[model samples]
Target: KHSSDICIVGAGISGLTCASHLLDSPACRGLSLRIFDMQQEAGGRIRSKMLDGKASIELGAGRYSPQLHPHFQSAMQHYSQKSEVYPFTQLKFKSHVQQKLKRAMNELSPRLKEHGKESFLQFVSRYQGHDSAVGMIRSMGYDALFLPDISAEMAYDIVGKHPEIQSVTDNDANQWFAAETGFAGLIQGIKAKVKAAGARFSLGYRLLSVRTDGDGYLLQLAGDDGWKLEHRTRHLILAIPPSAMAGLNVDFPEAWSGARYGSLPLFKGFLTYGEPWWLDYKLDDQVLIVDNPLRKIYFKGDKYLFFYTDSEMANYWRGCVAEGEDGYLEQIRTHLASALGIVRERIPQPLAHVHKYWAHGVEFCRDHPSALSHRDSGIIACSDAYTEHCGWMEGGLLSAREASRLLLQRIAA
Candidate 1:
C-alpha cells in the first residue's frame, strides 16, 4: 500500500485548509501528508479567467465574507494572501441594500423562525397573495435557493452587518473580499504553503473507495488515465463534498452523500465589452438587480460585467439555448437590455462572453439532517455543506478547521 500519515480526499480549499492548519501546529509538523483530487489542477472552485490582461473574473467560488469568517481570514494571512472587496456585494452594501434586505427579513423573520425547516419557496408561498414584497423577495438579482430543500433558516442572508461598507470594523474588513489577484490567487497561496510544509499532492486521481483497515484505512483510486492505485493512511480526511462520495464504493457518513442536504444550482457568466456601458445611463452602482434570465449583473472595473442566475432562471436559460435560437446571443442581449430597462439601441453588443452552468453549485438545508462529524467513525469528514455558512467558502474553511483539530488530536494520540 502507498502509505501516508494522513490522506486527504479532494484538493479543494477545505482539504488544503486542513493541511495548513496541521502544519501550523508545531506538534503536528512533519506528518506525512497526501492530497488527492480528480482535477488536473489543484485549486478546486476558485476558478479565474483573466480579462483586460490584468483583471480576472471568477467562474466559481471566488469571494469570502470575513464578517463571520475569522478562521478563514486567519488562514488567508497565515498563507500570505491579500483580499479585495467583491465588487458586486460591496457596491450593494454601499447602496444600503443590506438595510432593505434586513427590513424585508425582519418582516418575515417571525414566520421564518417558526417554520425553520420549511422550504424558502413554501415559506414565501404562504404569503404570496399578500403583496409584491413576497414576489420581490421570492426572486432576487443575486440569490440561490434549492428545490424542496433550502429552508428559510438556511437561505437567510448574513445578519447584523452595517448596511454601508464604510461602517465596517477592521474585524469585518474583508467582509466580501476575493483575493486581490483573484480568488485563485488565494488558493494558490495556500497550495504553496501546503507544498512548502511538505504535503504531497496527487492530482488527476479520483478517490474510488475508502475501506477500513487495521489501525488505518485502505484507499482505492483511479487516475485520469484509467490507472488504478491503492493507498493506506493512518488518518483519512474526506474534505470534498459529501455528494461526491455517493458514487464511490465506500460507505459514507449519513450526510456525506448529500442526500440529506439541500443543494442549490447556479449559473454565472462574464461578458466583456469595450466600455462600462451601464455608467452611460448614470446607473453607477456597477451592479444591477434584474428579474430576468440574467438575474444579477455586476460591473467589474472596465469592460467586464459578471452575471449570475439561480435555480429556475438558470434552467430557463438552459431551455432557451437548447430550444434552438437562430441568434442566441442576440436574444440574450435583448433580454439583458429589457431586464435593466435599457433602450435596445443603447445596449452594447458584448465583445466576448463566458458562462458556466453549475448543476450543484451550493448547499443549503431544510428538513435534512446536519452533517455527521464522522469523528465517532474515525473519519475526518467536512465540506461547505456541513457548516453553518452553507453556500459560502467560510463554511468549507470552518469545517476544515474543526476537522483539522480532531485529526491533530488523533495524530497526537
Candidate 2:
C-alpha cells in the first residue's frame, strides 16, 4: 500500500547519482523518493575492502585517470576523496616494440570508429597480417579488450577513454589514479548526501515485476527472506545493467531498443604475503603483464598483490579456485615466479588471500540510449551500459545525469 513520488531500482552509481541530482534540483524538493537494490550493500561494482584493518584494497573498479575521466575526477573532488597516481605509466614494452605497436595502433585508431560488427581481434589481425599483433594488444592490460566478441568501435572507445592504456600516441602523458581510500569512500560520501536529502534505500530487495498502473506502475519486489511487497510510483527508473534487465519478466531490449547487448566475465584475486618480498625486485606499485593465464598482476604498495583477468582467462581462474585453495595458491606461486623470472621456491606462501568473480562484470550495447520509456509510460531504463564509458564509473555519472534531465523535464511539464 506504500507509494512514492519516484522509485529507482539498482543502488549502483547510476541510481545514486540520479537520486542525488534530483534532490539537488529545486523543482524536485519535497518529492518522496526511494531506492532499491538486491545487494546487502551499495557501491555495486565499486567494491572495496580493508586489508589487515588498515590498507584499503579494491575488489572491483580499481582505477581511473583524471585527464580522461573528467566527470569521475570531478565527482571524486566533490566528495573530498583523495587520489594517488597509479603506476601504469611505467610501460614495460621495449622501445622498439613500443614504436611498432604505436605505429600500428595509430594507423588503426581512427578507422576503428568507422565500422561494423568486426571483432577487434579480427580487425587487428587482418590489418597487421598476423595474430602476433593481437597477442601484443592483449598484453597491455585487461585481456578482455581483445576478445573475439568485442567490436572494433567498442574497443576503440575503450582504449581511447581509459587512462591506463589510453591512446599510445599520447606517449604516456596521462596519469592514472585511484582513490587513496578506495572508491568505496566516494560511494559512502554520495550515499550519505542522498540519505540526508530524505531518500530512503531498500537493500536486499530484488525487483520481481513491474505492471502498468494507470499513469504510473506497480512494482513487485521480494526480499531475500521470502517476503514480498508491492508499491506504486508515479515514475520508475531502472538503473541496473543490461544483463539484469534481461533477467526481469518484462520484455527488455526486444521491446525497448533494437541494440545488440553483451557482457563479459571478470576475476580479480589478491595474494597477501607475510612480508613485501617483491619490493626487492622494485616491483612496488607496478603492473606486470604475463603471457600466462594470470594475465595482469599489480603490486599495490606492499599491501598485497592482485591479478586481474577477464573473458576466457577469468573462467580459467574460476576453475582453478573451484578445485581447492591449496592448489589455487600453488598455481599463483608458479605463475608469480614465472612472471618474475624467479624459481617457485623463492615465492613464499601468502598469509591471507581474497578473490571475487563477477559473471557480468562488464556490459555494453551498440546504441547509447539514456532513458527509454515503456509506451510513453512512467518506467524508464537507465544504465551505464548505454554510455561510452561502459565499464567505468564515469559512464555511470553521465548516464545518471542524462536520465535525471529527462525525468526532471517531465516533472516540470
Candidate 3:
C-alpha cells in the first residue's frame, strides 16, 4: 500500500485546489500527498475541447465571476494569469405561468404591511404575466439563477415560451462584461502552477473504494485496462459529487451514507458546439438565445461556445451521453437542430464536442445550511454542494479553501 499525508479523490478543480493549498503550507511540507481521478485527465467538469481548428470550446464548467469567487481570482493570481472580464449588456428574467403567478409575491417588499409569504410553487400557480416573463427570461439566460426556487416543469414552461433561447442573471451579466478568461486558458494556467509546486497527478485512475484505517484511509483504484492498485493516506479529501461515489463502487462511512448525500437532487445541464454565427452576429460573451433547445450561448472567443440546460432538458435531447470525441459531436447536433436555425449544410464540422450528464448537479437544500462537514474521519468533502451558491465554480473554490484551512488547523492542533 502506498501511504501519504493526504489522499484526494476526483481531480476536479476542487480537489486540485485543496491539494495544492495543503501541500504549499509549512504544516504539510515534509508529508506525502497524492491525487486520484476517474477521468483520463484532471479538471473534472471544467474541461475544454478544440473545435474548428481555431477555437477551443469549454464543454464543462464555463465562465467565472471574479467578484463572487475570490479563490478563483487568487488561483489565477498565484499563477500570474489574467482573465478578460466582460461587462453585462442585457439581463433577462423569465418564468413559466407558475413562476409568473409568483411574481406578485416576489415583487412584494418584505417590509410592506401586506407582504405575502407563500411557497415558490404556489406563487407560480397564481402568476398572470406568464408569457411576457417567460420571454424576458429566455432572452436573458436567467434559468440558472431562478430555477433553484421553482420546479423543472415550470422551468420548462418558460423555455417553451421562448420557443428557442437562453438567459443569464444580473450577477453573471456584470461579470462576463469584464472578464476575458476562457475555460481552457484558465485550466492550463492552474495545471501549470500545481505541477510546478511538485504535485503529482495520475490521470485515468478511477477510485473504487475509500475506507478508514487506524489513522488514515485506504483507496482502491482501477484503470481502463482492469489494472487495480491500492493506496493509503492519513488524510483524505473527496472533491467529487456524492452521486458519483456509489457508481464508482466506493463505500462511504455511516456519516457519508447515500441517505445523507442523496437528499440533494441532481438537476441536469448541457453544453453544445456549433458554427461561428455567434461571433459573426457579435453575440459573444453570454447570449440568451430565445426558444432554442440549447438556449444559453457563452462565446469564449476563438469561435468556441458553451451551452447549458437543466438535466431534464439535456436528457430529453441526449440521454446519458459521454464526454469524448464522438459523444460530444452527437449531442451537439441533436440539441442544435432542435433550437437553432442552423442549416443542415452549414452545421460547422467541429474538431471536437462533448457532453456530461449529472444525476445531481448542484445542492440547494434551503433547510440544511451546514450541508457538508470538514471533519469526518480526516476526510472532507468539497464542492458547490456545501454552500448556498451551490453548482457555481465560486462555491467550489470556497468549499475547497474552507476544507484546506480546516485540515491545516487540525494539523497545527
Candidate 4:
C-alpha cells in the first residue's frame, strides 16, 4: 500500500499546477503530494507534437490564448528562455473571403459598431460588412452567445471595432504567439522541475474507486500490470474532468454531482503535404476560415496543414465514414477548392495524415455554479467545468490555483 499526505488524480494542467505550487513555497517544501494519470505521459489536454526539428502540430490545448499569468508565464519562460520578445509568427485570413469582407466592412455604420447588443451574426454583418462570417459561425451552431442577450463587445475584448486585431481582415493586428517552443516543451519543463522537487508521479495509474475512510480518504487504483494499486491519503484533489463523476465510488459534497461539464465535442485533422502548395493560391496567409463542415484550417510552416471543426460541424462529421483518412482529406480539400474557386490541380496530395476526435468535448461546457462553492472538502474537483473561464486553458489554470489554495488550507489546519 502507498500513502501520502495528499493524492491528486489526473495529471493534467490543473493537477500539475497544484503540485507545482506545493513544491514552490517553504510551507509545502516537504509536503507529500502524489499526482496520477491514466496516460503514460503528463499534460492532460495541452499537447504539442513536434513534426520536424523546426515545426510542430498542437494536438491538445495550445498555449496562452494571448500569453500566461505572471507566475505561470515566468515559470514556463524560465526554460523557453528566449533572448528577446518576438512577434507572433503568422496569422492570415482566407484570401478568397477578403474582398467580400472589405466591401461589407465599409458598409457598417459607426453607431452599430459602437452600440449593438445584437447577436454575433448581427455584429459581423453590421461590422465585417459581410454575412460569410455570420454564416460560418451559425452553421457551426455557435450562436449560443445571444440566447438571453450578448453585445458585440460583450463576447470578448477587442470587439472588432477594429478588424485587424480579431482576424476580421486579411492582415492581422494581434497575434503574439508566446509558445515558440511549442506547448509541449513547457509541460516537459514543468514536469522535470516537479520531479526534481521529489513530487511523486504515478503515470498510467487509473483511479478505480474513491470513498471516505476514517478521518482520511481511501483510493483504489490499478496499474498497467492489471494489479491493484493502493493509495491512502489524508487529503485528495480530483483534478480530472467532470466525466469523472462516473468512476467515483463514494459520495461527494452532494453539490459535485449537479455540476455540468460541457465537453462540447470537437474534431481536428493534421496532414503533411509534399510542399506548401497552398502558397500558390495565396492561402499562405496561414489561417483559412471556411463555411464547410471543415470550418477552420491553419497553415503551419509550408508542409503542415491543420483543420478544425466544432459544434454542429464537429458532430456531423464525427460519425462520417471515410475510406480511412483519405476520404476525409478529400472531403476537406474539395470543400476548400469550392469555397476558394481553386482548381483541383492547385491542391497538393498528402504525404501523411492524422485524425483526432475529442468526443468528450471542448470548453465552456455549462454553467457549473456548484464548483464556485470553493469549500474545504477533503476531495476537491478542480477542472475547467467548475471555473468561469470555461473552455479555455485559463479556466484550467484558474481551477488549479483555487484547488491548490483549498488543499493548502487543509494542510494548515
Candidate 5:
C-alpha cells in the first residue's frame, strides 16, 4: 500500500508536463507525487529513431512550426535541444488538378464554421469542381483530413493551423523546425528534471482500475508479471489518450465531454541511399503527392527519403509491409520511379529502410475545451486529444498546464 498527494497515470508528454508543472508550482511544494506508465519508456508519441548516430527520422510526432508551436520552441530552448529547418515545408503542386484543389482550399475557412458537423469531404463537395480536392489532399499525405467523421472545423485545424502546407490562406510563408538530434533528447531532458525534483516513476505499470474513496481515490495497477499493487492518492490525474482511457473500467466522460472523439492510425517509412540521388531529379527538400501506395514522399536534404501516410493508407502500408521486406522494397522502388518520372530499373535500391506504424497516431475531440475534471471528485483527466492542437506537442503542453492548475486548486480547496 502506498499513499501520495498526487498520482499520475501515464508518462507521456501530457503526464510528464503535468508533473513538471506541479513541481514548479510553489503551491505544490513537497507534494508527494508518483507517475506510472504501461510502456517501459516515456515520450509517448514524440518518438525519434536515430540513424548514423546523428541524422534521424521521427517515428512519431515529427515536426513543429514557429508560428503555431511556441511552446515547442521554449521547451527545446529550455531543454538545450537544437532545431534544424525542416525543408519539407515548401510544397509545390505539380499538376493542374492539384493546383486547382489548392485554390479551393484557400477559400475554405469561411465556409468551415458554418458547416458544423459536416465532414470535410461533404463540405468540399459542395464547392464547384472541388469534389476531387479531398482526394488530392489525401494524396498530399494527410489521409485523416477527409475522414467521414472529421468535421470541417477539425479539418481546418489540421490544415490551416500548421505552417506546413497551410492552404486555408494563400500565404506563401511556411516555416518548420525539427529537433536536431530527434525529439528523444527533449524527452530525456524533461525526464531528468522530473526525477531531480524527487518525483517517483514506475514504468511498465499499467493502471487496471480506479475507484472513488472518500476525498481520495483507489488505483489498481498491474505489472507484466500479473502482480497487482494498490495506491491511494488525494489527487488523481489521468494524462493518457482517450483511446487508452476508454479501455479502462471507468465511466469515461462521465461529464467531461458533450462531443464525440476519435483516433487515426499513422505510418512513416524512411529509406537511405548511399548517395543523394534525389537531387539529380531536383527533388531535394520537396514533397510529392502520388497516386500510389507511397501516397506522399519527401526528400530531406541529402540525408534520407521518407513517406508519411495516415488513416486507410497507413493500414494499406501495414499490410504491404507484412508480406515481406523484399516485396515491400520492390513496391517502394516501383512507386518511387513512377512518382519521380524515372525508369524503375534506374532507381537504386535503398541501403537501409526503417518504418513505424501507430495504431492511434492522432487523437482528437469534436470540440476543443479545457481540461476535464469532475466538480465533486478529486480526479482530473487531460490529453492532447482534448485541446485544439490535438496530435501536436503544443496540445500536450496546454493540456498539462490545465491539469496541473486544476489539481492544485483541488489541493488548496
Candidate 6:
C-alpha cells in the first residue's frame, strides 16, 4: 500500500487543475500525492490523437476560449511558445434551410416568453399550436416527449439543450464569437506544466473503490494485470463525472451527494469533423445558425468541427460509438451521413476524423440543483456539466478555478 497526503482520482482537466492548485499551497507543500487514471494516456476528456501526421485531431474535449478561460489561457501563455498558436475566428453553418428556419424560431421567441414555464413542445403546441418544431426535432432523430409543467426556465433549458446561456444579459444575443485555441495544444501546455511541477501521473490505474479507513482513505485500483493496488491518503479529490461516481459506489455524505447526484438533466452528443467543405461555398465567421440540427461549427483554417446534441434522444450517452482505433471514425461518418446532408463520396476524406462523447454534454435544467455546495464536504465539483456555460472549455476551466479556490480555503483552514 502506498500512502500520500492526497489521492486524486481521474487525470482529467478538472482533477489535474484541482491537484495543481492544491500542490501550490503552503498547506499542501511537501505532501505526498498520487494521481491515477484508467486510460493508457492522461487527459480524461481533453484528449488528442494524431492522424495522418498532418493534424492531431481531438477525439475528446478540444477548443478553448482564451478570453474566458483563465486556467487554459495561463497554460497557453506559459508552455505554447514553440507551437503555432493561432486565434480561430472563422465560423460557418451548413444546412438545407437555415435562414428560413431561424426566422420562424425567432418569431416564436416573444410568444414563448409570454407563455413561460411550459415544455418546449407545449410552448409550440399552445402558441405555434401544433408541434411545428416536431419535424425539425424528429429530423435530428430526437425523442418527441414533453413534461406539461416544464417552466419558462425549463423551456429555455430544453430548447437548445447545449448548456450555453441563451443570453448574457436579458437582451443580449444568445451567442458571441471570440478567438479560440486548439485543444491538442492546450493539453500539451497543461501536461508540460504538470510535469514541470514534479507531479507523477500513472495511466491504466482504474480506480475501483474509495473508502475511509481510520484517519485516511484507501483507494483500490485495477489494471490490465487484474491486480489490485491500494493507496492511502488523508485527502481524496474526485475529478470524475457524477455518472462515473455512481459506478464506483463512492457514497458522498448525504448532503453532498444529494446536491451532486442527479442534480440536473444532462445530455450528450457527437460532432462530425472533416476538411473545410463548408468553405467551398464562401461561408465565413459571421455564420451563426440557431435552432438548427447541427449545433455549431468552428472553422480552424484547414479543418472544421461540427457540433450536435442528444437532448431528445433516449439513452443519449449510452448510445455512443465504441472505443478503438476505428471506433470514432466510423461513428463520425455514420452520424454525418445520417444527420448532415453529406454524401458518402464528398465527406471530405478527413485528414483525420475524431469523435468526442461526453457522458453529460449539456445541463439543460439550471435550477434542478447544484452538484457542489458550500454547506457540504469542502470538496467542490467543477465541470461544464453543472455550469451555465455548458459544452464549452471556458466553462470547465472557470468552474475548476472556482472549485480550486473553495478547496484551497479548506486546506488553509
lDDT of each: 0.67, 0.81, 0.55, 0.62, 0.80, 0.52
Q: How far is candidate 2 from the true structure (C-alpha RMSD, Å)?
A: 2.2
Which has the greatest lDDT?
A: 2
lDDT per residue for candidate 1 within 252-289, as digits (tens), equals 54524334555556777777776778766655436665
Q: Pairing residues by index, what is the TM-score of model 4?
A: 0.78
| Candidates ranked, most accurate by lDDT first | 2, 5, 1, 4, 3, 6
Q: How many backbone clashes does candidate 2 have?
A: 0
Worst lDDT 10-window in candidate 2? 90-99
Q: What does candidate 3's lDDT look like per residue over 103-130, in tens digits? A: 3333423323232333323333344345
Per-structure clash totals for the candidates = 1, 0, 41, 9, 0, 5
The reply for model 2, stretches above 4 Å from the true place, is 93-99, 108-117, 167-171, 376-378
Q: Which TM-score value belongs to model 2?
A: 0.93
Candidate 3 Cα misplacement greater than 4 A, ranges: 87-106, 109-119, 127-173, 177-181, 246-286, 297-307, 319-371, 374-378
Name model 6 segments beyond 4 Å from true: 64-75, 78-115, 135-181, 252-382, 409-413
Local lDDT at 272 for model 2: 82
| Winner on TM-score (1 vs 3) | 1
- How do the residues 200-234 of candidate 2 rate in per-residue lDDT, one tens digit apiece? 99899999988886777788999989899888888
- What's the lDDT for candidate 3? 0.55
**Candidate 4 lDDT by residue in tens digits, 225-316:** 79787788877888887767545764543545454334456777777777777777665535645556666666655657777665556666
lDDT tens per residue, model 6, 1-413? 47777766777767777676776777767777777888776666665665454544555554443344455556656654333433332223424543234345556677755766676666656645365555433332223224344454544543443213222113222332322333555555565676677667767888887666666677788985787788877766666666666577455434353343332222333333445565665542332433433333333444455444444432333354444445445555555454345665555545544444554543332342323542423444566555555545655565566666766565655
